[PDB]
Amino acid sequence: MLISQRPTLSEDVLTDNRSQFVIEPLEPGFGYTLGNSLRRTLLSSIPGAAVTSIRIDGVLHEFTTVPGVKEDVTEIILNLKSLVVSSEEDEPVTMYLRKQGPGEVTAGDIVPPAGVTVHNPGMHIATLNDKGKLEVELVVERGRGYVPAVQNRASGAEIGRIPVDSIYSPVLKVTYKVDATRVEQRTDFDKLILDVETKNSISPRDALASAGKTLVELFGLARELNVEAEGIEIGPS
Amino acid sequence: MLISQRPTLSEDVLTDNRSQFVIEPLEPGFGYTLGNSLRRTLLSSIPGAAVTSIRIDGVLHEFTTVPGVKEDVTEIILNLKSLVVSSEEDEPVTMYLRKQGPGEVTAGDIVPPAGVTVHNPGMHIATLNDKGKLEVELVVERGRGYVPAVQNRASGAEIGRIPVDSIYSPVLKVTYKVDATRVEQRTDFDKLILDVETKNSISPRDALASAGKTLVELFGLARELN
Amino acid sequence: THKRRLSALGPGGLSRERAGLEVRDVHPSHYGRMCPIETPEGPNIGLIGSLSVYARVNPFGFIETPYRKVVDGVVSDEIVYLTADEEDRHVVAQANSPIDADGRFVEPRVLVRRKAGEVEYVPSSEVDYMDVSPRQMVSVATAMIPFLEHDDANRALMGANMQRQAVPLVRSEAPLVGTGMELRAAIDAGDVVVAEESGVIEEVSADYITVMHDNGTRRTYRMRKFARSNHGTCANQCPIVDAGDRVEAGQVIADGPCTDDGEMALGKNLLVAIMPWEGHNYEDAIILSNRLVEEDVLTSIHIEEHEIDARDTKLGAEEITRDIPNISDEVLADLDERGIVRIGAEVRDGDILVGKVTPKGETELTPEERLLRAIFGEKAREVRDTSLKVPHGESGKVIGIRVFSREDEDELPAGVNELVRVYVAQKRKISDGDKLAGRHGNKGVIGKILPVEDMPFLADGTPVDIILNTHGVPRRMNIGQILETHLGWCAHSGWKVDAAKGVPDWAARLPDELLEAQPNAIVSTPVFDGAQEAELQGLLSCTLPNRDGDVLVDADGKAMLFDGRSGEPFPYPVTVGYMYIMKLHHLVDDKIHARSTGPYSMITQQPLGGKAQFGGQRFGEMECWAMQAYGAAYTLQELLTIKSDDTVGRVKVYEAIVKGENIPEPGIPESFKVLLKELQSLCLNVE
Amino acid sequence: NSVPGAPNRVSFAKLREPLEVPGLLDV
Amino acid sequence: QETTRVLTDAAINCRSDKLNGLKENVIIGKLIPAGTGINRYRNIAVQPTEEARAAA
Amino acid sequence: CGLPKLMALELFKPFVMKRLVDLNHAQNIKSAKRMVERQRPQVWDVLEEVIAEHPVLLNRAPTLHRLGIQAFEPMLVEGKAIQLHPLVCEAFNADFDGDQMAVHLPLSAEAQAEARILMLSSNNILSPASGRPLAMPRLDMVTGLYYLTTEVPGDTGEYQPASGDHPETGVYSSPAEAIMAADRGVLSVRAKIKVRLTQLRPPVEIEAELFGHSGWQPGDAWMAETTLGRVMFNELLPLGYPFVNKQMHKKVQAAIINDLAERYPMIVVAQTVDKLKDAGFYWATRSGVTVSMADVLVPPRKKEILDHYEERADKVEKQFQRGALNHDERNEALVEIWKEATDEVGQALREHYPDDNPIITIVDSGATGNFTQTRTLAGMKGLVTNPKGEFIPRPVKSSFREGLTVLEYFINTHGARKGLADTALRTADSGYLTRRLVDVSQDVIVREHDCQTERGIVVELAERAPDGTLIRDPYIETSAYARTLGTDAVDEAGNVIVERGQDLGDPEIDALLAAGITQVKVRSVLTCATSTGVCATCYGRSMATGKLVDIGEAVGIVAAQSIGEPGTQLTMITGGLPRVQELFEARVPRGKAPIADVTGRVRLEDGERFYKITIVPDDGGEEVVYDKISKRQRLRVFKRVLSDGDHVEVGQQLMEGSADPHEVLRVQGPR
Amino acid sequence: GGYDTPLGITNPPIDELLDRVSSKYALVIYAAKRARQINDYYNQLGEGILEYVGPLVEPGLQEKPLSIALREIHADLLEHTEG
Ligand SMILES: [Mg+2]
Ligand SMILES: [Zn+2]
């Protein structure tokens, strides 16, 4: 068959990592068969690294107290989950963060080992009051989607280690809705409007193409059942 | 931690015209959306063939009776709107139905041309007595979806031609269910089990292949074009 | 139910505006004679009613009602027909009273109805009459509602009044759950061909059935095919017997418009969910599936009749011929050589049906038109052109042409040479704006027709057909539409009450052969003696599996639906079932009207009214108060002068719109200058 | 009931009735 | 209300009208004296400011 | 609003007939007319050009108030039904069970300006009668937002903290992380969590202690212990609006839209109301509100309640059959017993139901309906009226879920038909009253800005207590809100707290109540001093716009429509719509109660089986004598009760009933 | 302040238009008279030149002159005097 039109993906660029896409005109109703899949594969299928578990010295009995700093542990934890970091060792690689004296600790005080990198060195984490040295140990690893707090099944090797939630997705918030453009000449077509916000590791344009690749490699499992079957063809550029 | 292994598709054949497909392993929360994106393309955009318009010898319109038969013409329209016929060429071809004498005009009396075929010789169309003669030709076209009866005024046909609604869709019923394992040490996956049943025109794996082809054609537009 | 109607207005009776509140109410003597439920809804409540089922009219004109007389506490069978006078002299028991096998009441005290209408509780020796049945107080149309006693009386009134407005579909499937009044309201209404004497079917065809009786002679029944009803609907009539069958006297031999196998079938059985879905079924609107358009579930046939007549005028005679004054040769393609169209020609809005041309005598042309005739060389053609064209907004095929002529001795009135009628068929689908309704007074127009892919489907992949709203169920007090939603699921799939160790406690008072039932079985709940609330809960716990072992509906009656549009399941279960819905005769194609400029009236030059003419919508008094309260002076002045009455402003506005200029200032309305003349003709010096 | 070619439609009626429905067009 | 007995004692008194309510301006086809129909609102003169007529 | 393309092609015929000759599609006007009447395929591309930004008036009969005519812009929709917006249906009082509406086309430039500015649908949100928002969410949107913003204790992924061996595990870095968690199976939307919001403005109590001097929230972080659903609700509300954190009833949403209409501009409220309807439909379809017969729970002890009250009724009937009490007395005793039985089974049904039942969530969220109908669904129908109007002493003890019997249904039909006949006659009577009210008051229009009178009425405005500082009067928002001061308010030597000429909104009323003054002289239209019509400052704030009234508003017609519109919901010495008809026609009532003419002492005398009342003054003078007052008219309580040995005021009422306005005008003057 | 981008009929917003006039009736007559001036320009332009000036803002392709009038009012390009 033949589509007798052509959809076009045309990006409209908002703020630096908040682009908005439109796809028009799709024959009815194809906004919903591809928009929900595009949102889910944007959210749960792009690889990336994040922090899994941290340990702070001298924190065992009361998990909301750090001696010397302002924030309790339930704030230093969620100041570390929003730490964008890309890694290359597909295995847990640890980092350290040690700082003495009064002053405001940022994310650039961390020492990255070989391979990992922190994409925002100007992110404040704690404010050391006076003469209190903070010593944190982080664990960075790769994955996808958001996988919650995996429990400490080491059971004795990790005394004060606490596990945190993992935001592995480079994208953060994707929403979609469809419309009904040109009901008479184009005869009641659709218009899918994506709205993808990323963290600053990759662009929202590069994060749309990776999910397109993982989806065209996913419906090709069904297309490789009978190659010369007749479906709707689009046409070249 | 990423499971670096690709999902594989496997197939169980239950009867001749329905089957199940197991796709595993997927990401947690991705079974339902994948199964629904396959169902919504299967149930709407699989091309097939159906009869577009018929013409009987003694009648002028749709709202009359043929002398000798038991059903009126609109009942023969509603009985012909359930034929399953798989064509092979682009042009509208014609098939014929000639019967004379008492008996039961079924769908196994249609003589088709070269390229097309009828897939149910047990469908009942009409019933005749000794004074009845049924002589009717049918026009078999190729398309997809569902399109209502193209008007006679919006065509060049004469008084005799009767436009019939067309349902070009071979698939009958599509469903799924997932097996969300999700063990509590965060090695989770899904397992999608599609269930496709078609109307004897195409096999289920020939119905899934065209849906996969349509989705590969469309989701490639969101690739490095932009 | 247009017969058996008892109307109070008319000649010699009371009026519609001079009628008080006393005659409209239900007197307590209406029990068994007039139905309290069925009555019209407008300004006629109480003035029009209908007879009961068992009522009967006295030789004097009073209304009788049967009763079973009971002697010494023992109910006999001597059925007496009482009138309303001597009903009060005795006392009358209740029909659902525990008679124990001889006539004796089980309990020593019976419910009873006393003289003034009081509802006493009297011991079982003063009782001297009993009702012959329940549902005795109720009419013919009201007795076809399953689960009547769970609906409020306003909604039961609307359900009885919306059953006589349904259209005849092209397939007419019998109801899956009904009362016992379907089979008797079809063979007595007369729209079903009934075999007269017991014979054996010799020859059947779609026009005629010749049966051969046991004693010699035959009989041929002629079916009426595609006859026009009084209201435009179809009157198709098909046989249901084959060419070798043995029939008996009284047996139904051919179905009618709304019948299936001899019993009434006004609508179809449709899978219904009671979830509110995305605001398309918002405040009584109904959304459908696209399966009902693809498979012609709610398709009807409508037949219109157009009539023209060639008369003798004062200047000659009007002639019906193909020779029409100045017109194209393209608009004469379907007309034959003698005027009228060909049978089978598809017409549309504006096409000529009967070519009729009337002599005009004389008028003199403008100089511009007389120049335009001399350039192209065309004659004056003094005869007019008054053809018969189809009205605005209609189309369809042409079934039949009936032509009466003076030259063939037909009976026509004085000075009518020819009279031709043309019938136009039209196969209407279902569309958004059409009005569907259930049996229980629920109704509502179609607001959306979803494709079959995005529609909440079950675990089988079977999508639902309609989606009704939740918020219309509890506040209208017609939850019987839930109960037939439940039983309609059971009758779809069939039950099997497993009495392998004993009959269970809920089914102790069920009859036999309801302990199990094959799928798609038709059941019947009578009106005031039907399925109890404690037996639907029993039949819902055995609801036999579809194709695989898979119970789709649990004991509560609710199912787990997927989402057709997003894919993931709905988080809570949803009541599904099979409801019987009917397509009412309030279609969109008969209601839509528009007017730019049409015919104007005679004395005052305001536009006409109604869709038969063109007609404009009336901008009355309260709309003027609303526009004055807004402060919009100019829109009010435009609606009241240059759109109705300003006779030189009307064509000036049209010229200014076409040439693209500004709308001029309004003048004086030509309905005000009529008032000055009718005041000066009353001898009043209005200056 | 008492109509020869009727479809067999089962009833939930717990009572029996002595008098059947009359000839509805006798008014 | 009571069109006969109002019309017959308006005529004896030779009573005149001035058309100041918004029920008689509705009848005679004039502009009602409320909203955009009063003088201070419908006698607005509109002209381009000069800078703009100036800049055009 | 959608429009059918056939109706819009026939409606806009000269405009398309001009535009397809400006474009070279037809030679002249005659071929253009033929091309339109034949519906050639080129004209649908021209109709979308000539239809854009050309508003149409939509109207639905009957046009009760002035909001029954509203202008919309059109957009071509396939089909033959007008697509109405689901929020204006409250203003039209339209339901979608087969109603029809009329479409008018304004032609000139003045009428197009009046449709675009004066009568647009998104310029009229509030009502001119009361000021409440009429385009507020309703039946489905209310239960959608109620399922969204409620809080379920013990839900999935709650705020745990059980620290000592593992951390809290209820915190979230942002609402984006909470949405990603809820896309897995870990979080419910109605579960209490602790998000960290960086884009929503905190409430005044939290922003005061967190920032204080400048508590702005475009980018500053604060932790909030809420649900996820209240965050997804508050993202719909505007950026500067404080965080709410409440369960959205209908009264809460009325308060929110009223505050948005007071403080924010008119184009913000319309977009906010649209976002609220979108989220309301999307969560009403996920709310899981279905009706089955397994959800209609019967009370498990209905039988013993009905047995106990049946025993009491049996004792009353035995006393009647013995001969102790007569006919009407046993009628009244049965009525009292079964009323108590009805209310007791109502309490049992109310306490039996779970709080998340689908039948009880629709009532409790204020979506639709009330409780009494639910009490007639499961439970007891109660007493049923007569055709006469009295009560049947039987009563109906079945419910509409158990099903009624034959006799109870036949009894119920009496009231069920009398109500329908009364509804028809009542909506016949109300239009006559609206017509007379429009006709008497059409020349009351606003004429100038200020007449500078100093007369004014006084307002009751929150009477003392018993010690007790000052509790509010219940009806302040209808008598004291949206007025203007005639005098400067002054506290106890104080200062001028609220000066002359202010709008008397909410903060001024709260300041007057804090200052301890319980009476305010208010400028009004009864004391306006212009020649023809009223003035702007004497009238006050127009309730529809929210600001001062303009100088051309026909406020008499708005005042007549505001009284004439809700007259259909007035069921009923008289109490219903005949009482309003009696007051506005200034007739003498049938239950005419005498009033005093002067202060003094009342001699109450009985006599020849009616009454006698003679008031003797304290000045003194000629006594006042009222002879014949029938025994059905009982005397009148204020202060024991009236009888003899009594001091009378000037215009004190002497019997109960209704004092005629002519006597109180003659005695106590116009004020 | 900051609301959204308005679409269709409601652009320019009626709140930022009522900062220019006294009440909403003067806006009606203001926009009506300005649209009648633009419509008188578009006709006496297909003949000799005349004095009715406008539009002062660059219009769209097919823009009704009432919306052009409202965009001229919103950008403070006209003046008016009440009678
Ligand atoms: Mg309605
Ligand atoms: Zn004043």
Q: Give C82's strand partners.
A: C65
Q: How far is A229 from chain F (nearest CA, A)?
A: 35
Of E27, E28, E34, nearest to C628 by CB-CB distance is E34
Contact A74 F167 (CB under 8 A): yes
The radius of gyration of chain F's CA atoms, rounded to the nearest angstrom, is 32
Nearest residue of B to residue F182, measured between CA atoms = B29
Q: How far is F12 from chain B (nearest CA, A)?
A: 26
Is the same domain home to F248 and F317? no
Residue A112 burial (10 A CB sphere; 0-12, 13-18, 19+)? middle
Query: Tokens 């909104």 correspond to what residue?
Result: F505
Residue A53 DSSP symbol? E
Q: Which helix (H) or strand (E) holds B53?
A: strand B48-56
Is the same domain home to F275 and F378? no
B62 near C CB under 8 A: yes
- Could you tell me if F236 and F256 are in contact, meaning their C-beta atoms sit under 8 angstroms apart? no
Residue C613, helix vs strand vs coil: coil
Is the same domain home to F254 and F309? no
Residue C425 DSSP symbol? E
- A127-158 burial string, b = 16+ CB within 10 Å, else e? ebeeeeebebbbbbbbbbbbbbbbebeeeeee
* Cβ within 8 Å of residue B215, ≥6 positions away: A34, A215, A219, A222, B37, B38, B41
Is the same domain home to A62 and A116? yes
- Could you tell me if A12 and A21 are in contact, meaning their C-beta atoms sit under 8 angstroms apart? yes
Query: Tokens 């100088």 correspond to what residue?
Result: F551
Q: Which domain holds residue B188?
A: 1-47+169-226
Ligand number nearest CA of F532 is 2
- Could you tell me if F255 and F237 are in contact, meaning their C-beta atoms sit under 8 angstroms apart? no
Q: How far is residue C532's CA from residue C540's CA, in Å, rounded to a whole number? A: 13
Contact E46 G53 (CB under 8 A): no
Lay out the sheet containing C523-524: strands in order across. Answer: C177-178, C523-524, D10-11
Contact G79 E42 (CB under 8 A): no
Q: How far is residue A35's CA from residue A30's CA, in Å, rounded to a whole number? A: 8
- Could you tell me if C275 and F131 are in contact, meaning their C-beta atoms sit under 8 angstroms apart? no
Other Cβ atoms within 10 Å of A60 Cβ, number: 11
Is the same domain home to F281 and F303? no
Is the same domain home to A154 and A53? yes
- F24-43 burial string, b = 16+ CB within 10 Å, else e? ebbeeeeebeebbeeeeeeb
Phi, psi of G6 (to 5 degrees): -75, 150
Phi, psi of C462 (to 5 degrees): -70, 120
Picking from B119, B145, B168, the residue at the C-terminal end of a domain is: B168
Residue C537 token pair: 């809960």
Is the same domain home to F260 and F335? no
Is the same domain home to F332 and F367? yes
Is the same domain home to A112 and A209? no
Phi, psi of F177 (to 5 degrees): -65, -35
List the Cα angle C34/C35/C41 in 5-degree steps: 115
Please state whether at least 3 CB pairs lie below 8 Å between chains B and D.
no
Comparing CA positions, the residue from A74, A133, A132, A84 lying closest to residue A108 is A84
* Amino acid at site C102: D
Contact C451 A32 (CB under 8 A): no
Residue B58 burial (10 A CB sphere; 0-12, 13-18, 19+)? middle
Residue C515 DSSP symbol? S
Q: How far is residue F15's CA from residue F1's CA, in Å, rounded to a whole number? A: 20
Resolution in A: 3.3
Comparing CA positions, the residue from C430, C476, C428, C153 lying closest to residue C300 is C428
Q: Which helix (H) or strand (E) holds A10?
A: strand A8-12
Residue C360 DSSP symbol? -
Residue C499 token pair: 């009495």
Q: How far is residue C513's CA from residue C494's CA, in Å, rounded to a whole number? A: 12
Is the same domain home to B81 and B125? yes
- Could you tell me if A119 and A48 are in contact, meaning their C-beta atoms sit under 8 angstroms apart? no
Is the same domain home to A30 and A78? no
Residue C677 token pair: 């003349």
Residue A74, helix vs strand vs coil: helix
Q: How far is the CA of F228 from the centre of ligand 1 (A)?
A: 38
Residue C666 DSSP symbol? P
Cis peptide before F62 (omega within 30 of 0): yes
Comparing CA positions, the residue from A31, A179, A49 lying closest to residue C565 is A31
Q: How far is residue A23's CA from residue A26's CA, in Å, rounded to a whole number? A: 7
Comparing CA positions, the residue from C188, C144, C141, C95 lying closest to residue C526 is C144
Q: Which helix (H) or strand (E) holds B135?
A: strand B133-143
Comparing CA positions, the residue from B67, A23, B80 lying closest to residue C225 is B67
Please check if F618 is assigned to a binding site. no
Comparing CA positions, the residue from C454, C403, C464, C109 lying closest to residue C272 is C464
Torsion of CA C341, C343, C345, C351, to 10 degrees: 30
Is the same domain home to F165 and F248? yes
Size of chain C in residues: 687
Q: How far is residue B113's CA from residue B223's CA, in Å, rounded to a whole number? A: 44
Residue F382 token pair: 């109660």
A32 near C CB under 8 A: yes
Q: Give C341's strand partners.
A: C335
Cis peptide before C504 (omega within 30 of 0): no
Residue F79 token pair: 């089909």
Query: Tokens 């475009």 correspond to what residue?
Result: F218
Nearest residue of G to residue F549, measured between CA atoms = G23
* Cβ within 8 Å of residue C150, ≥6 positions away: C478, C479, C480, C483, F400, F401, F403, F404
Is the same domain home to F263 and F300? no
Is the same domain home to B123 and B60? yes
* Amino acid at site F324: A
Residue F1 token pair: 């609003």
Contact E29 C641 (CB under 8 A): yes
Q: How far is E7 from chain F (nearest CA, A)?
A: 17
Is the same domain home to F306 and F333? yes
Please state whether at least 3 CB pairs lie below 8 Å between chains A and F.
yes
Q: Give C312's strand partners.
A: C317
Contact D27 C51 (CB under 8 A): yes
Q: How far is residue F175's CA from residue A78's CA, in Å, rounded to a whole number? A: 13
* Cβ within 8 Å of residue F28, ≥6 positions away: F21
Ligand number nearest CA of C285 is 1
Is the same domain home to A53 and A151? yes
Q: How far is A200 from chain B (nearest CA, A)?
A: 19
Question: Using CB atoms, which chains have 3+ pairs under 8 A with C?
Answer: A, B, D, E, F, G
Residue C131 token pair: 């009702």
Q: How far is residue E23's CA from residue C636's CA, in Å, rounded to a whole number? A: 12
| CA dihedral sign, ordered F90, F92, F95, F96 | negative
The DSSP line for C376-396 is HT-----S----EEPPTT--B
Is the same domain home to F256 and F372? no
Q: How far is the CA of F68 from the centre of ligand 2 (A)?
A: 30
Nearby residues for ligand 2 (ion, Cβ within 5 Å): F 451, 528, 535, 538
B124 near C CB under 8 A: no
Of F64, F285, F404, nearest to C278 by CB-CB distance is F285
- Could you tell me if C481 and C440 are in contact, meaning their C-beta atoms sit under 8 angstroms apart? yes
* Amino acid at site A35: G
Nearest residue of A to residue B23, measured between CA atoms = A221
Picking from A143, A168, A193, the residue at the C-terminal end of a domain is: A168
* Cβ within 8 Å of residue F203, ≥6 positions away: F242, F243, F244, F245
Q: How many domains does chain A have?
A: 2
Q: Which domain holds residue F305?
A: 293-424
Interface residue of F9, F16, F42, F173 to substitute, partner A, most A CBs within 10 Å: F173
* Amino acid at site E16: S
* Amino acid at site A112: P
Of A78, A151, A184, nearest to F76 by CB-CB distance is A184
Is the same domain home to F169 and F239? yes
Q: How far is residue F159's CA from residue F228's CA, in Å, rounded to a whole number? A: 12
* Amino acid at site F170: G
Q: Give C71's strand partners.
A: C74
Give the CATH number for residue F158.
Answer: 1.10.274.100
Residue F478, helix vs strand vs coil: coil
G39 near C CB under 8 A: yes
Contact B78 C170 (CB under 8 A): yes
Residue B170 token pair: 């071979």
Residue C511, helix vs strand vs coil: coil
Angstrom distances, CA of residue D26 to CA of C8, C37, C53, C55, F473? 20, 22, 11, 10, 69
Q: How far is residue C159's CA from residue C148's CA, in Å, rounded to a whole number? A: 10
Is the same domain home to B132 and B196? no
Give the CATH number for residue A214.
Answer: 3.30.1360.10
Q: Give B128's strand partners.
A: B69, B103
Please check if F538 is assigned to a binding site. yes
Picking from B168, B191, B208, the residue at the C-terminal end of a domain is: B168
- Could you tell me if A216 and B214 are in contact, meaning their C-beta atoms sit under 8 angstroms apart? no
Angstrom distances, CA of residue F274 to CA of F136, F237, F268? 10, 11, 10
Is the same domain home to A173 and A128? no
Give the CATH number for residue F347.
Answer: 1.10.132.30
Residue C259, helix vs strand vs coil: strand
Is the same domain home to B67 and B150? yes
Please check if F89 is assigned to a binding site. no
Residue C189 token pair: 């209404």
Residue C447 burial (10 A CB sphere; 0-12, 13-18, 19+)? buried
* F-chain residues near B28 (CB < 8 A): 184
Q: How far is residue F311's CA from residue C557's CA, in Å, rounded to a whole number? A: 38
Is the same domain home to B55 and B118? yes
Is the same domain home to F228 and F166? yes
Q: How many helices (H) and strands (E) does chain A have?
A: 4, 14
- Could you tell me if A125 and A110 are in contact, meaning their C-beta atoms sit under 8 angstroms apart? no
Is the same domain home to A127 and A113? yes
Q: How far is residue F353's CA from residue C230's CA, in Å, rounded to a whole number? A: 53
Residue ranges with strand state E in F177-265: 192-197, 222-227
Give the CATH number for residue B60.
Answer: 2.170.120.12
Q: How far is residue A115's CA from residue F69's CA, in Å, rounded to a whole number? A: 69
Query: Tokens 């976002």 correspond to what residue?
Result: F275
Residue C425 token pair: 């068929």
Q: How far is residue F381's CA from residue F412's CA, in Å, rounded to a whole number? A: 9
